[PDB]
Ligand binder design. Structure first.
Ligand SMILES: *[C@@H]1O[C@H](CO)[C@@H](O[C@@H]2O[C@H](CO)[C@@H](O[C@@H]3O[C@H](CO)[C@@H](O)[C@H](O[C@H]4O[C@H](CO)[C@@H](O)[C@H](O)[C@@H]4O)[C@@H]3O)[C@H](O)[C@H]2NC(C)=O)[C@H](O)[C@H]1NC(C)=O
Ligand SMILES: *[C@@H]1O[C@H](CO)[C@@H](O[C@@H]2O[C@H](CO)[C@@H](O)[C@H](O)[C@H]2NC(C)=O)[C@H](O)[C@H]1NC(C)=O
Ligand SMILES: *[C@@H]1O[C@H](CO)[C@@H](O[C@@H]2O[C@H](CO)[C@@H](O)[C@H](O)[C@H]2NC(C)=O)[C@H](O)[C@H]1NC(C)=O
Ligand SMILES: *[C@@H]1O[C@H](CO)[C@@H](O[C@@H]2O[C@H](CO)[C@@H](O)[C@H](O)[C@H]2NC(C)=O)[C@H](O)[C@H]1NC(C)=O
Ligand SMILES: *[C@@H]1O[C@H](CO)[C@@H](O[C@@H]2O[C@H](CO)[C@@H](O)[C@H](O)[C@H]2NC(C)=O)[C@H](O)[C@H]1NC(C)=O
Ligand SMILES: *[C@@H]1O[C@H](CO[C@@H]2O[C@@H](C)[C@@H](O)[C@@H](O)[C@@H]2O)[C@@H](O)[C@H](O)[C@H]1NC(C)=O
Ligand SMILES: *[C@@H]1O[C@H](CO[C@@H]2O[C@@H](C)[C@@H](O)[C@@H](O)[C@@H]2O)[C@@H](O)[C@H](O)[C@H]1NC(C)=O
Ligand SMILES: *[C@@H]1O[C@H](CO[C@@H]2O[C@@H](C)[C@@H](O)[C@@H](O)[C@@H]2O)[C@@H](O)[C@H](O)[C@H]1NC(C)=O
Ligand SMILES: *[C@@H]1O[C@H](CO[C@@H]2O[C@@H](C)[C@@H](O)[C@@H](O)[C@@H]2O)[C@@H](O)[C@H](O)[C@H]1NC(C)=O
Ligand SMILES: *[C@@H]1O[C@H](CO[C@@H]2O[C@@H](C)[C@@H](O)[C@@H](O)[C@@H]2O)[C@@H](O)[C@H](O)[C@H]1NC(C)=O
Ligand SMILES: *[C@@H]1O[C@H](CO[C@@H]2O[C@@H](C)[C@@H](O)[C@@H](O)[C@@H]2O)[C@@H](O)[C@H](O)[C@H]1NC(C)=O
Ligand code: NAG
Ligand code: NAG
Ligand code: NAG
Ligand code: NAG
Ligand code: NAG
Ligand code: NAG
Ligand code: NAG
Ligand code: NAG
Ligand code: NAG
Ligand code: NAG
Ligand code: NAG
Ligand code: NAG
Ligand code: NAG
Ligand code: NAG
Ligand code: NAG
Ligand code: NAG
Ligand code: NAG
Ligand code: NAG
Ligand code: NAG
Ligand code: NAG
Ligand code: NAG
Ligand code: NAG
Ligand code: NAG
Lengths: 419, 120, 120, 120, 50, 50
């Protein structure tokens, strides 16, 4: 009747995990393929997380380790015209630093942000740096930028990356329009918390994605279909000086500020932001009731790293207060100014044993970026607050459309052909 | 006409693109990339070894002397080759591939011994 | 009589040493040596896969059903096998090897389907 | 009935388990493990290449046109297939395997040339 | 900077020597067995001293 | 006199050592050094690793 016939080169695949490789400085449509996608169970996210951290750590290996600076500092108030918003933000700290010769010392004074230092014994002249009790700070190399250069992830032979082209796709379930790609689009590893910057926009509508939308323990990733432009600045002219603390080892610090001292801040158009939230609210009401109340509120608690919008602006690390963006209730040429704090001693990843010193940048800093999505958490009346402390969510927002499968070319079927 | 382009097509159409897929099976930081490459080679060789064991070495379409059990699938040829894509077919008989593979090996073992005794 | 000893000899003489060359295709500090070894294996397997696709698996000399186009080379057999060494020949037709390889694949694909329908 | 289970059995019994052993040939800290895996692949491919050179590609039992010299072993078939296990046989003719391998290669080289001239 | 050294500060109570206990009878049976086997490599009408 | 987390500070520490881990200097009965100070740097095993 019918006989087993063996075929090799069959267009069949199964879900699989593997190691993807980099490509830095092609697409086949698959006409009648419907595939099941599931962001949040996508291991491409876990790989990107580990690769970004590893590359970050590698870049600090050849940089000056600031152990000579774990000394007592004598700090007084800065003798300049400091506005009310900046009182107590800066301190003028003196210390005895090592030099290139072991039997010599030098007296150095520098400006530090208050967030980077701590009083000892509750004494108002003697302070230490924040990490002297937990870690050695490593200074980032001034020649190495923090720019989020795009990375493409490519599959090894025997594997393929499938891509979902459905414009209304929410990260899970069947995708009726699937193509095969050799390598992903370039993804910029932008590191930020509650507002996602410089990512991809939704093609048509604001898309709200959540692993379980009714579960208040889960985060909600909101992709915008329009960017909101945000303008950030540190409006102070910084004079950057350096000293040798060892054999070819230079430490960089702010010596002084030229002119008045003002608070760093970000500007979001008021009208654009109100249109953006109206769109988010309309989509939230498709998961929540229609005749409901949607309230936005500020982050409820935790340290500065999670209660603010954290980002790298021109090499400086900003911590902006977004209570001016998330303070409204929606029931059935102005701008919003967001105050920002600056830190030089940071921990980047949610880790304890590492710390980095970001050397100051000479001059005045300005950067412009696009808000392309929000990370929200949820508490009638539903209340939503900013979230985003875990960087894996930033990467889920770009990788949600990709899946990795293994090719299984061998198979059998009945035919009328016999050996 | 590219790799996996026929994935949504019928088995009898997709069977004409076997060389398209066959040619895409081959091609401390950097170690995990070597592991991926070594593993891809090992996977490839196991499938090739298996075809050799069944007497299908060197070919993409291989007819055998193993009859089909309708307990494996009782669909006719028009149901299988003019509908059920290969992805659909693979799901339907996944439970039976080890039984079929064992029967392909047993058959080849009888064939090689019957042919050596006819050359004697 | 050793590896590449026939490189300067005529194609018809050099064709008798094919096993001499075939056997010399197979065999942080130390990683670049693994990369070289993995790569050598991958190269080897791609050439073997290609012979299989063309229906030449397991042999050093393989005749096909692909006719020669004299647009590729219009030299006769005495010009090619009793002069032009293989190095010279390779230069002369380098521009045509992808056309020829495509035609070898297309032919094998028709042959395997015509043979399955005669076993039916 | 598992891997090497037949090692103590007679050659004529052990010859029926060839697929059992064939399938067990394939599958800074961690580098020596990659070296072991790369090496296992290279070993495998050399044995497969050698079978191809002798004209035995794709099969576990291969008959040739090379006669046996009784200078290699003068035992009869009952002594060899109904006694001397494969471990015992391997010891007895170890001194002659390179002579035999050379003669298998020479024979295949004459066979491929005689077959191309009959297709002409 | 985050580096802790651990040490014994003090001892509570009297200070005594650390020690191990092996059953006397079990040990004597064990050696008798060892001696019987040593005599298979050494002479039988011999003396084995530990 | 041990170092502390700050480079310009010192702390006075006393601890108990086994005699096998220390050696007299200059045959002096109050001044001893640790055994390895002349041949190696000692690394402390991590308390969290068994
Ligand atoms: C979101 O995307 C926008 C658009 O890409 C991005 O804005 C860009 O930021 C970079 C980095 O701050 C700007 O590049 C600098 O421009 C100044 C002014 O000319 C130059 O002086 C800088 O060069 C010095 O510093 C470099 C190290 O960063 C050194 O390598 C160099 O030798 C010099 O010393 C540098 O070129 C760029 O101009 C803007 N682009 C625009 C249109 O404004 C924004 O930062 C992204 N946001 C986030 C959070 O990633
Ligand atoms: C953010 O908006 C404020 C207005 O609220 C801008 O402040 C003005 O800046 C101009 C100089 O360009 C001054 O002449 C005005 O006197 C300032 N107004 C006030 C009320 O201070 C600010 O420049 C904007 N932002 C950014 C990020 O550069
Ligand atoms: C930090 O304090 C130092 C003094 O400890 C300030 O430097 C002095 O400035 C006066 C003028 O006001 C000069 O006459 C002195 O010679 C300077 N002393 C030294 C050691 O340079 C310094 O300006 C203060 N820093 C800031 C940003 O205000
Ligand atoms: C952002 O600014 C708001 C003020 O606009 C801060 O909110 C206040 O927080 C204190 C607790 O420390 C409450 O007692 C006040 O009632 C809050 N004010 C208002 C108007 O609600 C908020 O804490 C700031 N956030 C960050 C991260 O600095
Ligand atoms: C090691 O010597 C120190 C003194 O150098 C002992 O500590 C003192 O004990 C007396 C009581 O006998 C207290 O009054 C002192 O205040 C303690 N001094 C300090 C610095 O703590 C210590 O007990 C001795 N160690 C051991 C194990 O006996
Ligand atoms: C065809 O299969 C019949 C039933 O076999 C059983 O069911 C199948 C689905 C498998 O699970 C198999 O392992 C079970 O034994 C047999 O009774 C019948 O004899 C088979 N036909 C043959 C081999 O001639
Ligand atoms: C091939 O099969 C066609 C469909 O048969 C019917 O539907 C399938 C899914 C089963 O449930 C089967 O039992 C049903 O009878 C037939 O229409 C067609 O005539 C068959 N062709 C031949 C040549 O027999
Ligand atoms: C032989 O080739 C003739 C010309 O083909 C063209 O020129 C050669 C050199 C290649 O570049 C090829 O791609 C060009 O198309 C054909 O016109 C002729 O039909 C061919 N003979 C066959 C295939 O029968
Ligand atoms: C084979 O060809 C020989 C050489 O032919 C001439 O030189 C070559 C390079 C071309 O330019 C060709 O057009 C010339 O005619 C001939 O001498 C020889 O007779 C030919 N052999 C046969 C059997 O035809
Ligand atoms: C069989 O072998 C005879 C002796 O060959 C020699 O002895 C064997 C054991 C090998 O060591 C070999 O290298 C020696 O040459 C030959 O005289 C006889 O001709 C061979 N039979 C053949 C090839 O027909
Ligand atoms: C096969 O050989 C059997 C054993 O032969 C004897 O012992 C071997 C080890 C040699 O020393 C040989 O010279 C001896 O003659 C024979 O008993 C048996 O009959 C032979 N079978 C056939 C068909 O000839
Ligand atoms: C220094 O600034 C603090 C604000 O952080 C203020 O409370 C204190 O009184 C100031 N001291 C002097 C001497 O100006
Ligand atoms: C620096 O050294 C001098 C002695 O030369 C001392 O008086 C001063 O307090 C030291 N500075 C600090 C911050 O300890
Ligand atoms: C360092 O001191 C701060 C108080 O200034 C404390 O909160 C923190 O836990 C200490 N770190 C360690 C490792 O003990
Ligand atoms: C995402 O789409 C799936 C499939 O339609 C649906 O079951 C799920 O509830 C949706 N989740 C969200 C947050 O929209
Ligand atoms: C989603 O969350 C709800 C609680 O809001 C829970 O009852 C339900 O079982 C969860 N569903 C899944 C698939 O985890
Ligand atoms: C900042 O200071 C530099 C001198 O180092 C001067 O050339 C520049 O114009 C100043 N910029 C501003 C905004 O004050
Ligand atoms: C941001 O700066 C651009 C010019 O670079 C300006 O057109 C835009 O209006 C500014 N946005 C806000 C919110 O101030
Ligand atoms: C935001 O939208 C609401 C609802 O349409 C409206 O009442 C409110 O005035 C708007 N606010 C701004 C700043 O446009
Ligand atoms: C919710 O309101 C919108 C109009 O804003 C309407 O189109 C939609 O059908 C309503 N959905 C339900 C479930 O009533
Ligand atoms: C929210 O807006 C009201 C004015 O409508 C203002 O009084 C209140 O302070 C704002 N809350 C925050 C946290 O800024
Ligand atoms: C914001 O989005 C627009 C539209 O895609 C683009 O032209 C612009 O360059 C983006 N801005 C930034 C800072 O990337
Ligand atoms: C998809 O299905 C249509 C019929 O609805 C067919 O014409 C087309 O060829 C199919 N696509 C593929 C790749 O087979
Ligand atoms: C699908 O299956 C039926 C038999 O079940 C057959 O008649 C038909 O040819 C197949 N394909 C098409 C074209 O629907
Ligand atoms: C395949 O096996 C599963 C159990 O693993 C069984 O439920 C199913 O009915 C079987 N039949 C098929 C799909 O051939
Ligand atoms: C080199 O050419 C000469 C004729 O000039 C020929 O006799 C010799 O065999 C050739 N060498 C090789 C390796 O073929
Ligand atoms: C070289 O080519 C000519 C034909 O062109 C042929 O007669 C001769 O046999 C070939 N070889 C020699 C021996 O020159
Ligand atoms: C081969 O191609 C080159 C251009 O790449 C051309 O110049 C040459 O004439 C071609 N002919 C040969 C050598 O067969
Ligand atoms: C071992 O030898 C006995 C005869 O003494 C035989 O019956 C048995 O089958 C042999 N074992 C194997 C694995 O062949
Ligand atoms: C062993 O060898 C002899 C011939 O030497 C043969 O008669 C016998 O069949 C072989 N095997 C057995 C069963 O002893
Ligand atoms: C095999 O060679 C050895 C020397 O290497 C020799 O002693 C022996 O007699 C030879 N004969 C055999 C066992 O076939
Ligand atoms: C060792 O301790 C066990 C109880 O844990 C006890 O039964 C045994 O007799 C002791 N052995 C010796 C030699 O004291
Ligand atoms: C050694 O003595 C034992 C009895 O303890 C006896 O069994 C054995 O045979 C003796 N061996 C010799 C060599 O006398
Ligand atoms: C360290 O000193 C001891 C004596 O206290 C001596 O025996 C040992 O050899 C010395 N080690 C080295 C490396 O000299």
């Amino acid at each position: 009747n019918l006989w087993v016939t063996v075929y090799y080169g069959v267009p069949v695949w199964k879900d699989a995990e593997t190691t993807l490789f980099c490509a830095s400085d092609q697409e086949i449509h698959l006409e009648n393929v419907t595939e099941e996608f599931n962001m949040w169970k996508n291991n491409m996210v876990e790989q990107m997380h580990e690769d970004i951290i590893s590359l970050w750590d590698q870049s600090l290996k050849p940089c000056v380790k600031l152990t000579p600076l774990c000394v007592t500092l004598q700090c007084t108030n800065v003798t300049n015209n400091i506005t009310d918003d900046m009182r107590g933000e800066l301190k003028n700290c003196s210390f005895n630093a090592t030099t290139e010769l072991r039997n010599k010392r030098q007296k150095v004074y520098s400006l530090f942000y208050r967030l980077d230092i701590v009083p000892m014994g509750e004494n108002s002249t003697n302070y230490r740096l924040i990490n002297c009790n937990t870690s050695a700070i490593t200074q980032a190399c001034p020649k190495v930028s923090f720019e989020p250069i795009p990375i493409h992830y490519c599959a090894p032979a025997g594997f393929a990356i499938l891509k979902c082209k459905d414009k209304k796709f929410n990260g899970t379930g069947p995708c009726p329009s699937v193509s095969t790609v050799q390598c992903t689009h370039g993804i910029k590893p932008v590191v930020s918390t509650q507002l996602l910057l410089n990512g991809s926009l939704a093609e048509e509508e604001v898309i709200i994605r959540s692993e379980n939308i009714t579960n208040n323990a889960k985060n909600i990733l909101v992709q915008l279909n329009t960017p909101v432009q945000i303008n950030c600045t540190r409006p102070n002219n910084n004079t950057v000086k350096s000293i040798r603390i060892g054999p070819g080892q230079a430490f960089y610090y702010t010596g002084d500020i030229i002119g008045d001292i003002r608070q760093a801040h970000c500007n979001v158009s008021k009208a654009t932001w109100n249109e953006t939230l109206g769109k988010v609210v309309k989509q939230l009401r498709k998961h929540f009731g229609n005749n409901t109340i949607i309230r936005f509120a500020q982050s409820s608690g935790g340290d500065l790293e999670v209660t603010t919008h954290s980002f790298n602006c021109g090499g400086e690390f900003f911590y902006c207060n977004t209570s001016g963006l998330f303070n409204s209730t929606w029931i059935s040429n102005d701008s919003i100014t967001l105050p920002c704090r600056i830190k030089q001693i940071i921990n980047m990843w949610q880790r304890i044993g590492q710390a980095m010193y970001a050397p100051p940048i000479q001059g005045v800093i300005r950067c412009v970026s696009n808000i392309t999505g929000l990370i929200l958490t949820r508490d009638t009346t539903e209340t939503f607050r900013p979230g985003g402390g875990d960087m894996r969510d930033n990467w889920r927002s770009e990788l949600y459309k990709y899946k990795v499968v293994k090719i299984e070319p061998l198979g059998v079927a009945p035919t009328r052909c016999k050996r | 006409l590219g790799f996996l382009g026929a994935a949504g097509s019928t088995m009898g159409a997709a069977s004409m693109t076997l060389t398209v897929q066959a040619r895409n099976l081959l091609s401390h930081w950097g170690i995990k990339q070597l592991q991926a490459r070594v593993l891809a080679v090992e996977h490839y060789l196991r499938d090739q070894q298996l075809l050799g064991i069944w007497g299908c070495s060197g070919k993409l379409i291989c007819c055998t002397n193993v009859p089909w059990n309708s307990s494996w699938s009782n669909r006719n040829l028009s149901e299988i080759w003019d509908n059920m894509t290969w992805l659909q077919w693979d799901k339907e008989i996944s439970n039976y591939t080890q039984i079929i593979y064992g029967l392909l090996e047993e058959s080849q073992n009888q064939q090689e011994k019957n042919e050596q005794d006819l050359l004697a």
